[PDB]
């Protein structure tokens, strides 16, 4: 029956890491290796699964995350990383097999549009009424920063600082964040996230053959 729809990936401006787009698939047939032949994969490292296996297994759900990402920040996009990307931008599950891919959009992939630059939330805290004490807001797994409400979808300058007033239910004070940037590259480089879940008598996201 039906085929898994990866099309959105190939058409638009992929968001920055902290605004990742997510496609969620059930009851479909996929050809992941076809998808990745459209790009220059620079890195493909999984956790509790393999590149070979993730292309050929049956799932209850396959979940795919995509965003613009500089290849020069490879060390921060890692299932073992403790940098700003897992702290404030993007964190995957530990209790499910996952994978992280680093690609480059080739010139003959012409429906993928570049943003001005790459930007990531380098700090997301919450300070108290004392305007000094800072309480980090670490991102949950599979979720966005609470501080994406105050960060522009693309940060104009390295170091820009954002602020918003909190009601007393949340402790008063401000929600505070700060952003860093990386110069856009000649070809758009991206990062992808894959997460699989296995079920009992309900594995319907299986490879096409």
């Amino acid at each position, epitope marked *: 029956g039906v085929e898994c729809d990866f099309s959105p990936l190939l058409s638009g401006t992929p968001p920055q890491v902290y605004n990742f787009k997510r496609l969620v698939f059930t009851n479909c047939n996929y050809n992941l290796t076809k998808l990745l032949s459209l790009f220059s994969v620079n890195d493909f490292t999984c956790s509790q699964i393999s590149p070979a296996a993730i292309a050929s297994n049956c799932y209850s759900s396959l979940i795919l995350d995509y965003f613009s990402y500089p290849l020069s920040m490879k060390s921060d996009l890692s299932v073992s990383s403790a940098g700003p990307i897992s702290q404030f931008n993007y964190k995957q599950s530990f209790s499910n097999p996952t994978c992280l891919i680093l690609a480059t959009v080739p010139h003959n992939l012409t429906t993928i549009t570049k943003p001005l630059k790459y930007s990531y939330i380098n700090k997301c805290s919450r300070l*108290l009424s*004392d305007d000094r*004490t800072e309480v980090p807001q670490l991102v949950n797994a*599979n979720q*966005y920063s609470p501080c994406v409400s105050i960060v522009p979808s693309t940060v104009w300058e390295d170091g820009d600082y954002y602020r918003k007033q909190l009601s007393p*239910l949340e402790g008063g004070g401000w929600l505070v964040a700060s952003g860093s940037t990386v110069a856009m590259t000649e070809q758009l480089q991206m990062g992808f996230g894959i997460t699989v879940q296995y079920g009992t008598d309900t594995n319907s996201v299986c490879p096409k053959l």
Partner: antibody, heavy 111, light 112 residues
């Protein structure tokens, strides 16, 4: 581990007085607003009072304005809810929270 | 208990595995400029935070729970509806008019 223990609850005649406590552990207390929520048996939760982490401002429900007082001590990681001229509508289970963790309540009965 | 500022239509039906939502409606002084929190309470137990800051999920809550906030109303959707989901579900938010927090009427879901 995060724990939140109330006390003080009990029996009082209408219009009497009753002081509640709530001790906390397992987090940085001086970072959270703390507040009291009550539940009359078989009914919904109703917000009672809130006090900031600086013994700042306090907030009250119109049901309890002028009678209740919320207090706070950061050296003991403790909260107080003073209740005066209590009434039959003050019968409830008294919960103490930040937002993430709740406590097993304490009983307030009056009739 | 004198009527809450929030309207929580309290009946919520479904079936195992179904998706039931809980609609919490209010006014522009509470939902609309303030964050929503969602709570779950089992028969005779303390409440538990499910969703905070309208969409956020504390680690420990199953992924089946998620929250959203449009302009004036907020809702808690549940996928893969289970049997431990038989509980009472409440929304809450700050109110700039009362300068106090507001809870909803409280919905009870029953599913089997």
């Amino acid at each position: 581990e995060v724990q939140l223990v109330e006390s003080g609850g009990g029996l009082v005649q209408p219009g009497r007085s009753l002081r509640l406590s709530c001790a906390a552990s397992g987090f940085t207390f001086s970072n959270y607003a703390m507040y009291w929520v009550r539940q009359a048996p078989g009914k919904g939760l109703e917000w009672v009072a809130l006090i900031s982490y600086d013994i700042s401002t306090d907030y009250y429900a119109d049901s309890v304005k002028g009678r209740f007082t919320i207090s706070r001590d950061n050296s003991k990681n403790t909260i107080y809810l003073q209740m005066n001229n209590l009434r039959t509508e003050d019968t409830a289970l008294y919960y103490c929270t930040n937002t993430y963790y709740w406590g097993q309540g304490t009983l307030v009965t009056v009739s | 208990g004198s009527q809450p500022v929030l309207t929580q239509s309290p009946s919520a039906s479904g079936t195992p595995g179904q998706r039931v939502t809980i609609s919490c409606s209010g006014s522009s002084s509470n939902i609309g400029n303030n964050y929503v929190y969602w709570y779950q309470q089992l028969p005779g137990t303390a409440p538990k935070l499910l969703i905070y800051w309208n969409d956020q999920r504390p680690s420990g809550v199953p992924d089946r729970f998620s929250g959203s906030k449009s302009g004036t109303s907020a809702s808690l959707a549940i996928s893969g509806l289970r049997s431990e989901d038989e509980a009472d579900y409440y929304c809450a938010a700050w109110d700039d008019s009362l300068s106090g927090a507001v809870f909803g009427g409280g919905t009870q879901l029953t599913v089997l």
